Design a protein around this ligand. Structure first.
Ligand SMILES: [Zn+2]
Length: 29
RNA sequence: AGGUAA
């Protein structure tokens, strides 16, 4: 369930609700 | 839990 950030392409651990690197929320699309 | 290698 890891997820890729639309904004910076970082692959975020499933448990994160915001990107680890750029802080963009998972729902921000 | 675990972060840059994904
Ligand atoms: Zn990001």
């Amino acid at each position: 369930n890891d997820w890729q950030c639309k904004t910076c392409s970082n692959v975020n651990w499933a448990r994160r609700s915001e990107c680890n690197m750029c802080n963009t929320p998972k729902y921000a699309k």
